[PDB]
Amino acid sequence: EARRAHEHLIRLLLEQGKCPEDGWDESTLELFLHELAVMDSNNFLGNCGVGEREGRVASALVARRHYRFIHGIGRSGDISAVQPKAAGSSLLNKITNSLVLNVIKLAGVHSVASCFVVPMATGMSLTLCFLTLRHKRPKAKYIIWPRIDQKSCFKSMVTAGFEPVVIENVLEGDELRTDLKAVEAKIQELGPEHILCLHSTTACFAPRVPDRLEELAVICANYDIPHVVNNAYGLQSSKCMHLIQQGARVGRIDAFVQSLDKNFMVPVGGAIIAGFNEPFIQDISKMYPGRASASPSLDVLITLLSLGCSGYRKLLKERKEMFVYLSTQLKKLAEAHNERLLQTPHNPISLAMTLKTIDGHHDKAVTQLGSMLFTRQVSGARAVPLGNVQTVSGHTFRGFMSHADNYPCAYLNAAAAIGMKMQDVDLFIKRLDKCLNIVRKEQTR
Amino acid sequence: EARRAHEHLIRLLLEQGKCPEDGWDESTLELFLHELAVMDSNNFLGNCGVGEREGRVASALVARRHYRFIHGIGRSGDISAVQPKAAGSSLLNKITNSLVLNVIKLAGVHSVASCFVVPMATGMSLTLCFLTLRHKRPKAKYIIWPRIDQKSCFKSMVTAGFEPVVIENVLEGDELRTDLKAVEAKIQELGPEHILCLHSTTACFAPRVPDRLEELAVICANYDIPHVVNNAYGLQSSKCMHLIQQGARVGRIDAFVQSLDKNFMVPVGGAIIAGFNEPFIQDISKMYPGRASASPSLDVLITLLSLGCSGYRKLLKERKEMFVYLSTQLKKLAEAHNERLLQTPHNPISLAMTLKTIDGHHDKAVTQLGSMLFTRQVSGARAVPLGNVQTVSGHTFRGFMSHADNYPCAYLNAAAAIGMKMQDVDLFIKRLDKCLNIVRKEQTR
Amino acid sequence: EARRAHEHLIRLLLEQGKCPEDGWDESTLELFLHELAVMDSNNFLGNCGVGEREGRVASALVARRHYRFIHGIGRSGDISAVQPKAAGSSLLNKITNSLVLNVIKLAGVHSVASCFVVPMATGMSLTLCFLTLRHKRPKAKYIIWPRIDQKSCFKSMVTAGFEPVVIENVLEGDELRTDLKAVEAKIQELGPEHILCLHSTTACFAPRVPDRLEELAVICANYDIPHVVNNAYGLQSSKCMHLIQQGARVGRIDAFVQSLDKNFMVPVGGAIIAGFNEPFIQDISKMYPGRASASPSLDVLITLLSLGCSGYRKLLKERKEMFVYLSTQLKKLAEAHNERLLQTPHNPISLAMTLKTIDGHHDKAVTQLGSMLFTRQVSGARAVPLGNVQTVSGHTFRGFMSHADNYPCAYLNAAAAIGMKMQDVDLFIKRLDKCLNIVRKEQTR
Amino acid sequence: EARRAHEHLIRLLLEQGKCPEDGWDESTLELFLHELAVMDSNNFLGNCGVGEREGRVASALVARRHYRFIHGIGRSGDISAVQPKAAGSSLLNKITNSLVLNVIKLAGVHSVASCFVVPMATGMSLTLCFLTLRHKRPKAKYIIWPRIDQKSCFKSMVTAGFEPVVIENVLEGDELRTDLKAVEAKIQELGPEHILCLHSTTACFAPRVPDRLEELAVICANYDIPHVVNNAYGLQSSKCMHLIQQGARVGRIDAFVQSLDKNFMVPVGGAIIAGFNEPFIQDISKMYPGRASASPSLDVLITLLSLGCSGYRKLLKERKEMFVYLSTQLKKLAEAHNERLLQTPHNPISLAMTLKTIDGHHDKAVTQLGSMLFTRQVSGARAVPLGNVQTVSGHTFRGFMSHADNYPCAYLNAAAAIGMKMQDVDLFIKRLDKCLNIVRKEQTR
Ligand SMILES: [Cl-]
Ligand SMILES: [Cl-]
Ligand SMILES: [Cl-]
Ligand SMILES: [Cl-]
């Protein structure tokens, strides 16, 4: 029978909480979602509501677009608690968290113990980790942070009410890498007890590379200092994930956070907080005040059930292939223009070519190139000039955008992130070739 | 011409940022949304993306349900900043914030200066206010809080890293009201400089009533202490809103926060932070780290454009009418069962009847009644027994659920919140009548 | 339990095939439709297809918009037969036909024996009746037809391959009515055996009125001639339906046909063929070659389940009320302009006011008025001048649009059909007032 | 600019009425459809309606699923006429007909002069052709028809009111082919003037093959007899289409009809009537009484714009590839079971393997095999036994399902039609292997 076949897949999902190997048909998925929504009290035929939060909906467009899931996730006192007024939404949350734990394993952190989706972006999710740690370490005021010029993760420390201690990176060839000795020197200077945590970063803009997590995990273990990893867009990278797995095996990592949109191709606004100590990850979840949106969870649930394990693995494989293609094409273009691809082997996602030939003419040509690319409908390229000075949440960054005060040259940043197509690379190369030719003609003529 | 008529309404909205008096047809709304989504770079026909956040979407179900709005709101460094990669989503955010400012005025706070939608629930939004105030008042550690037994707003203070100072309420007739003298005694005891803010509450469970905001505003003004108002579900009440307006006219109110779901009949997960000092409200917004979901904003935009000013006013009028109906019906039922409606004239939304006839038999009958109602598909009723002891985020509440250590009696709580129908009251009354008869027969026989 | 409540309604529908008294929630309806679609073999998870009609769909937009119902209705040899490849679509067809039989009863023909939805408009559905009758009456060549100036029902006879015999109407006061003596004179002239059927009409443009069905039913009974009734938009009228019921009680009516769009507020393209002799109605159905669209059936099923019996009755009641309102408003406007409402008491839907004051100036003012109304976004008004000559499918109509060669005056036609709102009448009156004033000023100045 | 890019594609479509080479994004398509729907008067903001057909819609689900296209296609007197009440739907119809003419050319009939979509299935569409020809040839009573055991196309002649003259096929090797001499003998016997048309068939169940259209076109040309081609599922086949093109070049073909679902992967219920003489094809269109559904047209429009020319060509290519794969796999399976693939080179879509090893045991094993396949979720396979006698619309077919009285053996029919996947063939082969093994074990043990 037809219905029994659909029921079989749903039962499989419910029993073991795992991603199906092959993606579900839309028919099975929508049957499932409708069944779940039926379980929420706001959708009961015989329901009457006499409270202030009854999940009433004014607009049919709003009700339909959310599959009639209105109550959000959690209870008033606990985002992790089953909501008796919303049994279907509760199940939705539970299954989604289980699917995500599974995917974290698949992606390369096979020892992850606990995780939960939180409907806040990565910056605010990092903030939530810091807020949790306040209560564990009431003497702490500082967060030690190897520099990365990204405003959200920087602001996350300030928003939490802590003082970032910015550790400058070491130039090693073309790469900017973790200054482990500076990290330790700051721990000793300020005192371990006064450090809330070390806040490290994996996926990042080239020529920075993922932090030396193994060595940082050892430092944190030895000094008894929490270690929080900003894995914003590292889940899509087996290299980044293995770094986290290794870190956890050789030392201390207390939490790692990743963006839903950047790793699962869904709207901005959700993140996953994960870790190796279940009580601690639970403590972070319990720190969340109030109910929360179910919308990011629904998105990732729809996405993972539709892809299956095989679909997601395929996307990860294709990203690695696109990285190789992007790198080859960009090196070819760069060398044709008397530039070079910066040697950034430790960065698995992000690449950079030099812009030495247009820089140094005192005409803002690097910044102009970024503008020209943007007007030609290239998005996500970063034209990084030298000498930017910017103050962000109380800290003045010299060489802002380059993750160092004195990076040797201007460069252009491109990346092969999940869901990239050959057309993205090909149009980019074609448009970049044209823009470079235009700038050089202007500077020459 | 047909298209020109639609364009006229869209232009009207764009020019003045105001709610249309009459609600838009679905056709106009969906034309508008599709036009806006077209403006986001991820939807450009000629686009190529070479970044880590390109708003790529894997599932067509996910893309469609969000009207192809994928980039969220804000920039990395600023949730209020226009996003050049998402011009349509930026406009969506700007218009939604303008519509909401207008509705706040319509609802009764005609002097509101600034507001923004934040895709977090009210608890976390209150937390964000406290996080902002940390930086203004680095010596402060305490938040003075007139007691209300609601876990989210309580946890919001703890999550922010502050010590709540719980002020017990005064029993005045049947009502529990603000103890102004206790509030002042604590300010003097602890020192104004050590108070982060006063955290007051408007809409609440009867027999508590909205806080004495005028008097609290004077205290805060005189002692130079910020005043943050938890208006979670008070926007739907002209009485609550006038209280805020009056508070701002006679003294100090720095921010007031309200729930999107509870006041606009949309999914849980969004809130509005509003105030009278634009730079300060802007400072709260700037404290948010990273981009955020556009989903709550889209929901309220769809809802407000569909209702128009007239539709929303109608809902507010109907809520007042349902309150009268609920009150009359509940008083009639109560008196028929030898109970009474508690005299709570200062509470415009929430009502309570006594449960003296089933209480005191040492059989947990009050709690049982709540269970019986729930199993009969009544949601949102609160059966409040005497003597609950509960510890929540480090504070032990005696008489938990009753907002006092020693409320004189057990009671049942019902409310007339926005979107309530006659059927809600009628089914509630019928089912409650039956449950009371059952409990009394059990206790009698 | 939640799901059981939905199942109860679905089981009720399936058991007795009747319209629910109250309309289903959207949630129940969409649960039902998804369940039905699951039953169609094209939606089976384990299906493989090796035929030329597998219900494959290329576009997801197409699949979704039709709720994954792709196989249509019927088998190759029989539109009424259960389709083993599409059990869900078969059930959809069966239930829809049962719901429609019920509604025909509700609407006033309580003795209807059999009916089926056919995904053709009324003209083609009338054609199908005539095609069926060919085989019953191989000697017949003529269809006797009391005149109505509507091209579809006229063409239906020609398309079927028969010669219409146009019977002119009798002017009785302001009304144009059936010439019973002319009908009989033609039967005698041509011979009963050479008449395929009498083709009568109920709902029609004023000042024509529904045909004298009782008397025509007697004539047909006595002469042994089939009687086919064009009830295109008469189902919405209890007066029209009672006329059919009475006709069937006092004489012969073999089939009556009505438009889905005009009576159920759904897209154009479907009709219902109904009758009192089940074998004969079955014979009409069996005359249909091939499978047919399920789209009109799905539309009416969604519509009737959503309205319930009460919702549909309400619409019928509201139409009667709008007719009274339209009549009162139009009479008032007419008399204000020195015109009058034509006395057409036997027409329950359509009304006419005279246009004597603008007619007769040799300037095409009547036709101009129709154009002016149209440009001011009034649709469905008919400005009928005198003296139109038009040849339609071989027949030359003098006085075309007026259903007579020599109607005494020009007039404007307005109607109160199902789903009309007060705004329709009010805007119409306002716009008509303005247009008349403009024409008269032009003719005066 | 973003919107301009979408406008460019829409303008391209509107100017030349041609299929885009590459498929449109969903965003462009839905922008277009919404723009078109805005043009229909029922969707005008300032509209008032005072007629009986105002395109009012009761259910929001119905309105939305049809993109607010409610008025259907055509005017009362003409399905081809622009509808002033529905300018958007009129444009929708015009563009769809233009796209389809283009695709007919692409598919292999490059000299097609005129075509139109009709929202009836192929049987009824054939009927419409015959109904048109009645008026051209009032002396005609017979339709000469080379036998094919398919009930719809057979019934189409009877429904139109004509006597089919069934011409038996010639067994040539394994193939059943047109008996040209029998066709001519009947023309001479009955008289050319008494023949309404020759009704030939292209795509068909093996071991029948497409009719000898070149030779039939010559016969029709010479005898002055219309030629109507049932191309139900031949459009997807360049072999079938070239046969039609050749027929038109060497003789007479007046019309050819094809199924929307079978060739374009959309719901059942639509067809395309096409021809080489524009006035005649126009005459067929004009024979349609009344307005008609726009739903099939919308489906094919969405489908063709989404695929583009390249997407449709790809599907045609893939069908040829799947035919080769199906043939190879079926021959391999057949020979493994001591059966053979019937030699049917002139049939490009449909294949047959012998069932001699299970036939002849007087146990209905062939029919049982068809049942067993069906219960194992194989659809579209035809198990054809010998000796079926069936009367269909007055004609008794001996050997029914085999297109001959005395086909030499029982066989199983499988086909590679458009949209077939490797999984369809692979599951079919696996399941067929199992079923054959089961039947043979039963017959052996
Ligand atoms: Cl990697
Ligand atoms: Cl109020
Ligand atoms: Cl009536
Ligand atoms: Cl072919």
Coordinates of N, CA and C in Angstrom, one line a residue, chain B residues 25 32 34 59 71 87 104 112 116 207 228 248 276 289 296 363 377:
Chain B
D25 N -5.3 44.0 -1.1 CA -5.6 42.7 -1.7 C -4.3 41.9 -1.7
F32 N 4.1 43.2 -4.8 CA 5.1 43.9 -4.0 C 6.2 43.0 -3.5
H34 N 7.2 40.0 -4.5 CA 8.0 39.5 -5.6 C 8.9 40.6 -6.2
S59 N 16.7 23.8 -1.2 CA 15.3 23.3 -1.3 C 14.4 24.4 -1.9
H71 N 18.8 36.6 2.3 CA 19.9 37.3 3.0 C 19.7 37.8 4.4
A87 N 19.3 44.6 -1.3 CA 18.5 45.9 -1.4 C 17.0 45.7 -1.1
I104 N 2.4 51.4 16.8 CA 2.6 51.8 18.2 C 1.9 53.1 18.5
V112 N 6.2 57.8 20.7 CA 7.3 56.9 20.4 C 8.2 57.5 19.3
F116 N 12.4 49.1 16.4 CA 12.9 48.1 15.4 C 12.4 46.7 15.8
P207 N -4.3 37.7 39.3 CA -4.7 39.0 39.8 C -3.6 40.1 39.9
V228 N 13.2 50.1 32.0 CA 12.9 49.2 30.9 C 11.6 48.5 31.2
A248 N 6.0 58.2 30.1 CA 7.0 58.9 29.4 C 6.8 60.4 29.5
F276 N 11.9 56.4 23.4 CA 11.6 57.8 23.2 C 12.9 58.6 22.9
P289 N 25.0 41.6 17.4 CA 26.1 41.1 16.6 C 25.6 40.2 15.4
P296 N 10.4 37.0 10.9 CA 9.4 37.7 11.7 C 9.0 39.0 11.1
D363 N -6.0 17.1 47.9 CA -6.2 16.1 46.8 C -5.7 16.6 45.5
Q377 N -9.2 20.0 25.6 CA -8.8 20.9 24.5 C -9.1 22.4 24.8

